Amino acid sequence: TTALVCDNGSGLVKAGFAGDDAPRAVFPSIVGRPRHQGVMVGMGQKDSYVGDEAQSKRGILTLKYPIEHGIITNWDDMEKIWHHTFYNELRVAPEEHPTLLTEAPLNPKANREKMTQIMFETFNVPAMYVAIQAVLSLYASGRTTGIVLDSGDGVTHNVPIYEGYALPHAIMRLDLAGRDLTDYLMKILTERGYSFVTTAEREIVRDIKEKLCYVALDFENEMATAASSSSLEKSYELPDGQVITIGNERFRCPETLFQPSFIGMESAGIHETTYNSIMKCDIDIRKDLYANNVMSGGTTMYPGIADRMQKEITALAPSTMKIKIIAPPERKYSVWIGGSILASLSTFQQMWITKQEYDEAGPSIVHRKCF
Amino acid sequence: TTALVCDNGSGLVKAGFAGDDAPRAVFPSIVGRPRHQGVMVGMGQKDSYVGDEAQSKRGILTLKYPIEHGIITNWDDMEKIWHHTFYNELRVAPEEHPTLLTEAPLNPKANREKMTQIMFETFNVPAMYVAIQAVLSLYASGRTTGIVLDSGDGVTHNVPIYEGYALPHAIMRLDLAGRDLTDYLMKILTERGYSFVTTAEREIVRDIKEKLCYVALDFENEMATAASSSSLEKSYELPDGQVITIGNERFRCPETLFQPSFIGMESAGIHETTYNSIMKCDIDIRKDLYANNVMSGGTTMYPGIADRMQKEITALAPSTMKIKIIAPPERKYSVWIGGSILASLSTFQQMWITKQEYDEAGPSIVHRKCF
Amino acid sequence: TTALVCDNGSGLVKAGFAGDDAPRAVFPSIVGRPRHQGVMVGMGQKDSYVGDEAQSKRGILTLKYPIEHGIITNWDDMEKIWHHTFYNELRVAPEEHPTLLTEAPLNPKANREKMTQIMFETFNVPAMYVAIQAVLSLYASGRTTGIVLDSGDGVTHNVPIYEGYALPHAIMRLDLAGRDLTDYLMKILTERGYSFVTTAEREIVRDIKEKLCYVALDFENEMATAASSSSLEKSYELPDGQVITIGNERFRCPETLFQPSFIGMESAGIHETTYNSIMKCDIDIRKDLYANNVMSGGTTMYPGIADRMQKEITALAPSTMKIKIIAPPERKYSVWIGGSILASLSTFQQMWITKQEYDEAGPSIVHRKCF
Amino acid sequence: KEPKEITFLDAKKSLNLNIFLKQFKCSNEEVAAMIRAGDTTKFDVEVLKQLLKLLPEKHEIENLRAFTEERAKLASADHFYLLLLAIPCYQLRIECMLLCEGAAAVLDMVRPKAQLVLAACESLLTSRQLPIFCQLILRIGNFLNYGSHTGDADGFKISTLLKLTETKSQQNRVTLLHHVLEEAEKSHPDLLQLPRDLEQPSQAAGINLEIIRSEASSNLKKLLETERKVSASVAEVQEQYTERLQASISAFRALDELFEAIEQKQRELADYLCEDAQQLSLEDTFSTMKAFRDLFLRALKENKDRKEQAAKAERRKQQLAEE
Ligand SMILES: Nc1ncnc2c1ncn2[C@@H]1O[C@H](COP(=O)(O)OP(=O)(O)O)[C@@H](O)[C@H]1O
Ligand SMILES: Nc1ncnc2c1ncn2[C@@H]1O[C@H](COP(=O)(O)OP(=O)(O)O)[C@@H](O)[C@H]1O
Ligand SMILES: Nc1ncnc2c1ncn2[C@@H]1O[C@H](COP(=O)(O)OP(=O)(O)O)[C@@H](O)[C@H]1O
Ligand SMILES: [Mg+2]
Ligand SMILES: [Mg+2]
Ligand SMILES: [Mg+2]
């Protein structure tokens, strides 16, 4: 029996079978409702479009994200995501395959209650399991200890896990991630005069952020160079045929990750969040966490982030211990990959939360079983 | 010498002297070129009419707005507006007078750059300043804190200012104002048979909207009453002597301000925009923002907009907060009034932009000096 | 000449004249800097705000504590604290009044050095003295023997004094007090969904801690009662009109005082610290220390802490000893009361440090003179 | 189905070994070959730490050697331990690879920092503008303390440079150090080239030299014990590891010669500052000179901002006077 690994991400849902290297269905978590008037008769005009069907027809659809900051807001939209990724994407019955799911750290408990209730009652399963995304990222790295900076679309958290034990107090969570970077990029793109007000324009600027943006190694020198010469100015072609050009904004958008006061989110930087999460731990285990800095998530897929992150941590930490940033190229699906690593194992069969345990203990044995 | 306050608003330009109460020259910003052939020799046949002379002879003139949604489109047209209000209207020498200018927030930077270049090179000044319109509206209100919903002819923006300090993350810009309401009114008067296609007809429909339209407190009961009885119907005499009679369109036209889906815009209403601007601020300062709503601009000159705005915000806010909408009768000229307030201070005299600063820094001092 | 008593604790400052009972100026020791950049005019806005003025405008101010765990971090901020509590609160000159000051035990000496240097160079005094807060708390107790648990905002220390002879080896200091309880309460209110991430929200959570939190007599019985029924739930109105309701977190917050393993601190509770400090003394004097357990500081103002302290000490001590907890209602202000008692003593008038002693011995006589 | 994996381990250790084995993305025969060849490319400190933390136990090795059935019936964990038991002196080879990679890591960690500390001591013994600047501070302090017991002195200690910023003017903004640098910007600019001599004293040690010295001595002792165990082992392990052990012991002996050079320069710096050597004249002097250089550059930057603000105020006053 092949299990199903499904990261229901804030930004992108990644799903597929057990033990695979790549996830089968990778699609953004949006729900598209029509906002203009349908005039043509027949021909299957749906009242809601889910996933890539909403992505293709995004010019006439109001787009809804069901998850904000790692918290499932719209439950019916999330049910549409779940039913689409079971029946249209993977085309598998839920009643004949167990399912692994992901959860953000410092989540509300009733989110886990409703997730367990929906995944046992709406789509009946033989078994399911809920795992922490940072644990699956560290398992995707293959190391038992280390600290994972997991950065999705709504939430960014530093979790140190020593020898398979996730430290609860040392988990640090900041709700600043790539959707906030997308909204800040939509704000600063009006400096050159490119107005973006719609939800489809958010997807266009998100594609611009995925393609063109990059982390600067030194923000002041890059700003002085972009002010001096127009070498960093890059042209992007829009789907209507218009061509825009952007300069310093290729690095000003991820600089909000290092300088969170750009959007007024008054908090420390993510390197400072990482260093304070390290200093929350014991001094005996700090040398292990300094050389095992794993960065997961697609938000960390800018091609300048590792050297700047090592520079900022090496500035923050003393020069005693070795600083090593773990940046795999397959990090964007790595949680799913770690779930696939947790899928095929022999000792996971006792750890499956069964239907009988759900009927015995409600949707509340996931709190005492999973961490 | 005496400073000059010249609000270059999107529809109308209000010019005058600092320290004065009423603006000296209030005239609409239009450029009138002749579209038919002239047959009489001589008689001072100009190739371009500006403002009130273009308003007078508007039947034979193609009319062009130089400012579109707070952005100066044709710079030669705006040069003609500035030359007309400097030399024909106010009749002053620009080289012996400091000048205040007003600007919308989230505006493209090169508009401010070319405004600095024209106001230092074409009309050279001893000093100039560029100020945000909501700051001037709060200064005309006289209170140190509050939130300004400033809706002109092109830009409706929500800006909250607490203790004199601007919060730029909660500044919310939406380009939906009275010219778009005029175009929607020109769309909906074709249901009764009254066709209007020309720019002179656009100014006639604008005059109809200024004279007859009003904000309904409840849209549905007013629509049911207008469909029920012809009590709300009003008649207007056109300049050829034709008399039109309109019903529900007196309140259907400003309802686009509360429902942008009528013109197909995906964004929500200005009350929802104000609630999102309040909720983007910190949790401490919201109680002062609830009771200090400062409505400025000519678009707030409908005689039902304050009660509807209080009703919608009181529906939106938690119920234990005091909702107070401050609607002064002189809110149309409040940008000029606050400019005359701010220009007449001895503390403001160090805050000017001088010619030496311009020759030192190029036209780039205005980004670092002005907010 | 009226002497001054200025208890400069980590969170609050209680200052006033000697020979008085009620502290004349009680205000929090916070320094508020403007968080967002804005110049404006504002009719002479202050560049920093001290205490109640910083508490008033706290939504737009970065709040900085100059003292952390009894140790002054920012000395210029402490100088601004001293200037406000000399010139604005009390409105007295420093050079015409002697000023008694308080200090936690086991302070690093450079804090005492810079305190003496500031109190003799820039805020110059005729005389000053640096004392121990537990000695002043026993002075407000009125007896001579006994052990004092003084718990301020950063420091909880147990000091035994027998016949006026403090034993320095048995003084036990633990850096766990009400600021750490406030940080733990900010950590545990996120379970119920309420988010508090800013320093202005720390004041709200600290007010929740001061009003609603209480010490459980039995932790496990109260936890089972809160898990069973919601009768221990208490509501609290937020300043934006929102109402929260909290259950077990009323008594989970002070249980960090008796069990520091909640926040990961490896040390034992303050009852075990008290028992170890009593058992570190001589065996003859321990009966007076059991009968004169004095609790002071504002952190011990929860209305269950004396019964729980008596229960834990009577569990720890042999049962033949009489266990008595001295818990006055004025234990919050007792350090300032004992400072007025000490500065009112005629025998203490030979113990002051003069300006000529500071000039002759440098800034080094305060180690030899003061304990 | 075949659930009888005949695994002699428990669930958790076999779980952690199945976590550990799957990151290599290859068969366990390649892992046993890389153990036997001593290849350290895929084997960093953490992988060999996890491998030594998942060592086979005595009853596990005894049950593997008593297993007489087909070896395909075993799990991948027990087959990996049978491949591990097939390697002679396998734990010795793992300890050689771990100690060689750790010795290379600690040598590249410590040795540029130790060269920085030695160059810091050499530039603190021999500094060009430091006696002229100390003579200027001495003359200004002898003018300031004229009439007191501290004045009319011929010198001061190195802690006086930390106390330069403690003394301030009537405005309480221009310090003693700020006024001396505002005077030295006009009169003697060569003292502004003082950090160019202090740039090797810049960044200090930043570390405790006793911690890295005890780690270097413990690593050298472990390398000597490991080379003695390899010298007791077979000649294949000898030809695999003895040259790497000899280079590691030679580089750590050069590091111990460097540490003795730092001790000799520490005694010379204690005699330079006229202080006894029993107190900490090494890390306190590095922290003192690092803080002195940081306050020196901050005084340069604050005097630069003061002169720029005075020039901008003069330009604003001239522009207001012209208007
Ligand atoms: N190359 C890239 N550059 C910048 N941002 C990216 C890149 N790739 C992905 N992202 C963003 O990072 C986020 C990380 O996605 P992921 O964590 O896999 O899903 P989710 O964020 O929904 O949990 C995505 O929402 C995506 O928008
Ligand atoms: N009595 C009125 N009722 C409703 N709207 C009005 C009235 N008078 C003017 N307006 C609208 O206000 C606009 C003028 O706004 P204005 O004060 O010129 O703003 P700005 O200066 O920013 O352009 C006009 O376009 C008109 O549509
Ligand atoms: N009602 C209360 N409940 C709980 N804690 C309190 C209360 N009042 C004051 N505190 C605590 O007392 C501390 C203030 O100490 P205080 O008695 O003013 O001495 P000092 O002025 O030396 O700091 C603060 O940390 C605060 O948390
Ligand atoms: Mg994801
Ligand atoms: Mg205007
Ligand atoms: Mg105090």
Short mmCIF file of N, CA, C and O and ligand atoms in Angstrom, two decimals, chain C residues 7-15 26-27 102 133 151-154 177-179 182 206 209-211 213 297-302 331-335, ligand 3:
data_model
loop_
_atom_site.label_atom_id
_atom_site.label_comp_id
_atom_site.label_asym_id
_atom_site.label_seq_id
_atom_site.Cartn_x
_atom_site.Cartn_y
_atom_site.Cartn_z
N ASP C 7 14.60 54.66 44.84
CA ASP C 7 14.66 53.24 44.51
C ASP C 7 14.55 53.11 43.00
O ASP C 7 13.48 53.27 42.42
N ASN C 8 15.69 52.83 42.36
CA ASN C 8 15.75 52.69 40.90
C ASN C 8 15.74 51.20 40.54
O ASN C 8 16.76 50.60 40.19
N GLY C 9 14.55 50.62 40.61
CA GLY C 9 14.39 49.24 40.20
C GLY C 9 14.33 49.09 38.70
O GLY C 9 14.28 50.07 37.97
N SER C 10 14.33 47.82 38.27
CA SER C 10 14.52 47.48 36.86
C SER C 10 13.33 47.89 36.01
O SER C 10 13.49 48.31 34.86
N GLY C 11 12.12 47.77 36.55
CA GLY C 11 10.93 48.08 35.79
C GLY C 11 10.37 49.44 36.15
O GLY C 11 9.97 50.21 35.27
N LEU C 12 10.36 49.75 37.44
CA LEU C 12 9.79 50.98 37.94
C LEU C 12 10.83 51.73 38.76
O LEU C 12 11.83 51.16 39.22
N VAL C 13 10.59 53.03 38.94
CA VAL C 13 11.37 53.89 39.80
C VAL C 13 10.42 54.49 40.82
O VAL C 13 9.39 55.08 40.45
N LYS C 14 10.75 54.32 42.10
CA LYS C 14 9.99 54.90 43.21
C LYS C 14 10.93 55.87 43.92
O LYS C 14 11.88 55.45 44.59
N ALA C 15 10.69 57.16 43.76
CA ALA C 15 11.57 58.19 44.29
C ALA C 15 10.77 59.16 45.15
O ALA C 15 9.56 59.31 44.99
N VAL C 26 6.11 57.42 41.71
CA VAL C 26 6.18 56.04 41.24
C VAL C 26 5.87 56.04 39.76
O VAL C 26 4.75 56.40 39.35
N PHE C 27 6.84 55.63 38.95
CA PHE C 27 6.64 55.67 37.50
C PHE C 27 7.50 54.58 36.88
O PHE C 27 8.56 54.27 37.42
N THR C 102 19.47 52.43 46.00
CA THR C 102 19.34 51.00 46.25
C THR C 102 20.11 50.21 45.20
O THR C 102 20.40 50.70 44.11
N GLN C 133 18.60 46.19 48.89
CA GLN C 133 17.15 46.28 48.92
C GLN C 133 16.53 45.37 49.97
O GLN C 133 15.47 45.68 50.53
N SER C 151 11.87 40.40 45.33
CA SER C 151 11.67 40.06 43.93
C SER C 151 11.17 41.30 43.20
O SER C 151 9.99 41.67 43.33
N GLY C 152 12.05 41.95 42.46
CA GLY C 152 11.69 43.15 41.72
C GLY C 152 11.20 42.85 40.33
O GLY C 152 10.25 42.08 40.15
N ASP C 153 11.84 43.45 39.32
CA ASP C 153 11.46 43.22 37.94
C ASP C 153 12.42 42.30 37.20
O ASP C 153 12.01 41.62 36.26
N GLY C 154 13.67 42.24 37.63
CA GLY C 154 14.62 41.32 37.03
C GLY C 154 15.27 40.36 38.00
O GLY C 154 15.70 39.28 37.61
N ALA C 177 12.08 37.21 37.56
CA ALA C 177 11.10 38.07 38.21
C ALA C 177 10.06 38.47 37.16
O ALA C 177 9.89 37.78 36.15
N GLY C 178 9.35 39.58 37.43
CA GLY C 178 8.09 39.88 36.75
C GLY C 178 8.20 40.21 35.27
O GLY C 178 7.22 40.06 34.53
N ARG C 179 9.37 40.67 34.81
CA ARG C 179 9.57 40.86 33.37
C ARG C 179 9.63 39.52 32.65
O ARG C 179 9.10 39.38 31.53
N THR C 182 6.20 38.26 32.49
CA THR C 182 5.49 38.95 31.41
C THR C 182 5.86 38.38 30.04
O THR C 182 4.99 38.22 29.18
N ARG C 206 1.47 42.88 30.62
CA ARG C 206 1.90 43.16 31.99
C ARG C 206 0.74 43.65 32.85
O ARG C 206 0.67 43.32 34.04
N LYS C 209 -1.17 40.59 33.62
CA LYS C 209 -0.43 39.89 34.67
C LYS C 209 -0.64 40.52 36.04
O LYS C 209 -0.74 39.82 37.05
N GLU C 210 -0.71 41.85 36.09
CA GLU C 210 -0.91 42.53 37.37
C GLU C 210 -2.34 42.42 37.86
O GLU C 210 -2.56 42.32 39.08
N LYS C 211 -3.32 42.43 36.96
CA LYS C 211 -4.71 42.40 37.41
C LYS C 211 -5.22 40.98 37.62
O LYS C 211 -5.77 40.65 38.68
N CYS C 213 -3.71 37.66 37.00
CA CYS C 213 -2.94 36.48 37.39
C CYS C 213 -2.85 36.34 38.91
O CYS C 213 -2.88 37.33 39.65
N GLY C 297 8.90 43.37 47.38
CA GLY C 297 8.85 43.55 45.95
C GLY C 297 7.44 43.46 45.41
O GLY C 297 6.56 42.87 46.04
N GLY C 298 7.21 44.04 44.23
CA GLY C 298 5.89 43.97 43.65
C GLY C 298 5.56 42.67 42.95
O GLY C 298 4.39 42.43 42.66
N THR C 299 6.56 41.82 42.70
CA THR C 299 6.31 40.53 42.06
C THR C 299 5.62 39.57 43.03
O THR C 299 4.81 38.73 42.60
N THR C 300 5.82 39.75 44.33
CA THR C 300 5.16 38.95 45.35
C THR C 300 3.80 39.51 45.77
O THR C 300 3.34 39.22 46.88
N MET C 301 3.14 40.29 44.91
CA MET C 301 1.84 40.87 45.22
C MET C 301 0.67 40.04 44.69
O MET C 301 -0.47 40.52 44.71
N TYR C 302 0.93 38.84 44.18
CA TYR C 302 -0.16 37.95 43.80
C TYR C 302 -0.84 37.41 45.06
O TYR C 302 -0.17 37.13 46.05
N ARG C 331 4.35 45.62 50.80
CA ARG C 331 5.62 45.01 50.42
C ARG C 331 6.12 45.48 49.07
O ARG C 331 7.30 45.29 48.75
N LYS C 332 5.24 46.07 48.25
CA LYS C 332 5.65 46.70 47.00
C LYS C 332 6.51 47.93 47.26
O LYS C 332 7.55 48.13 46.62
N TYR C 333 6.10 48.76 48.22
CA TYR C 333 6.77 50.03 48.49
C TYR C 333 7.76 49.93 49.64
O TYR C 333 8.27 50.96 50.09
N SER C 334 8.05 48.71 50.11
CA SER C 334 8.77 48.51 51.37
C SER C 334 10.25 48.85 51.26
O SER C 334 10.88 49.19 52.27
N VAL C 335 10.82 48.76 50.06
CA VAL C 335 12.22 49.12 49.85
C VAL C 335 12.42 50.62 50.01
O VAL C 335 13.38 51.08 50.64
N1 LIG E 3 -0.42 44.51 41.18
C1 LIG E 3 0.72 43.89 40.77
N2 LIG E 3 0.72 42.58 40.45
C2 LIG E 3 1.84 41.95 40.04
N3 LIG E 3 3.03 42.57 39.92
C3 LIG E 3 3.17 43.88 40.20
C4 LIG E 3 1.99 44.64 40.66
N4 LIG E 3 2.41 45.90 40.87
C5 LIG E 3 3.73 45.95 40.58
N5 LIG E 3 4.19 44.75 40.18
C6 LIG E 3 5.58 44.43 39.79
O1 LIG E 3 6.50 45.15 40.62
C7 LIG E 3 7.62 45.62 39.86
C8 LIG E 3 7.92 47.06 40.24
O2 LIG E 3 8.69 47.10 41.45
P1 LIG E 3 8.54 48.30 42.53
O3 LIG E 3 7.83 47.72 43.72
O4 LIG E 3 7.99 49.51 41.84
O5 LIG E 3 10.08 48.57 42.94
P2 LIG E 3 11.13 49.36 42.01
O6 LIG E 3 10.64 50.78 41.88
O7 LIG E 3 12.38 49.22 42.83
O8 LIG E 3 11.13 48.59 40.71
C9 LIG E 3 7.25 45.44 38.40
O9 LIG E 3 8.10 44.45 37.84
C10 LIG E 3 5.85 44.87 38.37
O10 LIG E 3 5.81 43.74 37.50
#
